[PDB]
């Protein structure tokens, strides 16, 4: 009954985009997964770009309920609007209704194991973009330790947190989910120059239940 889990009422359409090349850089998507694009107003919760990227939403339509994984931006979607994948749309409605009424809310993701960090290509001690994947709840704040004090990083529309002059040593980092739960983790040192491509690092924590 809080702000983060408030129930949205809107309409859904269906689309086959979002399994590949979504704006949120969450590939690879299981081709059998039920997914959705999210309208700007909710995706950018509180003005935080991509705040609900990778969230799981429970969606109720006229005739069923499904859980979907936010992988794309839905650029022209109205308030509370979803652009559902076809299997998710069919599980809650009739494809020949074109557009259906929906109600939805953020819910806990079916994650096992800890969060996963994706370091964007070209990241370095000078400029880096760090994405958090496999999180039980949407991630709204990313902090790291520098000279003994925490430094908050902004989230981008491509669902990474960007930081400048982060240095080239072991990063002590701190994450906050949309409920305000805080976890702390460590991450290996960034590349010294930005001549590298994507790589993934396992994290050592997971937001609680």
Ligand X SMILES: O=C(O)c1cc([N+](=O)[O-])cc([N+](=O)[O-])c1O
- 113 lies in the site for a second copy, by CB under 8 A: no
Per the CB < 8 A criterion, the answer to whether 1 and 7 are in contact is no
- 150 lies in the site for ligand X, by CB under 6 A: no
* CB nearer a second copy, residue 29 or residue 111: 29
Chain residue whose CB lies nearest ligand X? 46
Site string for ligand X, 163-192 (x = CB under 6 A): -------------x-x--------------
Long-range contacts of 205-208 (CB under 8 A, 24+ apart): 205/114, 205/115, 205/175, 206/111, 206/113, 206/114, 206/115, 206/135, 206/136, 207/115, 207/135, 207/136, 207/137, 207/175, 207/177, 207/179, 207/181, 207/183, 208/136, 208/181
Site string for a second copy, 169-208 (x = CB under 8 A): xx-x-------------x-xx-xxxxxxxxxxxx-x---x
Measured distance CA(40)–CA(25) in Å, rounded? 16
Task: Give the shortest CB-63-to-a second copy separation in angstroms.
Answer: 25
Task: Give the shortest CB-62-to-a second copy separation in angstroms.
Answer: 26
Other CB atoms within 10 Å distance of the CB of residue 150: 12
* CB nearer ligand X, residue 108 or residue 111: 111
Which positions touch ligand X (CB under 6 A)?
A: 28, 45-46, 48, 51, 116, 133-134, 140-141, 176, 178, 200
């Amino acid at each position: 009954s809080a702000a983060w889990n408030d129930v949205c009422s809107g309409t859904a359409t269906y689309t086959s985009s979002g399994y590949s090349g979504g704006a949120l850089l969450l590939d690879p998507i299981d081709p059998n997964a039920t997914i959705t694009a999210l309208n700007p107003k909710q995706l950018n919760y509180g003005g935080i770009q991509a705040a609900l990227a990778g969230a799981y939403l429970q969606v109720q339509g006229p005739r069923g309920m499904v859980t979907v994984y936010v992988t794309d931006l839905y650029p022209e979607g109205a308030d509370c609007g979803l652009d559902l994948s076809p299997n998710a749309f069919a599980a809650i409605g009739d494809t020949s209704a074109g557009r259906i009424p929906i109600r939805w809310q953020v819910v806990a993701a079916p994650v096992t194991g800890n969060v996963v960090y994706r370091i964007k290509e070209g990241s370095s001690q000078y400029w880096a973009a760090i994405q958090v994947r496999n999180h039980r709840y949407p991630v709204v704040k990313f902090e790291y330790k520098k000279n003994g004090d925490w430094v908050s990083l902004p989230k981008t529309a491509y669902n990474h947190f960007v930081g400048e002059q982060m240095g080239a040593q072991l990063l002590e980092i701190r994450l906050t989910d949309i409920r305000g739960q805080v976890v702390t983790d460590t991450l290996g040192a960034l590349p010294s120059q930005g001549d590298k491509g994507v790589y993934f690092a396992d994290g050592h924590v997971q937001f609680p239940r």
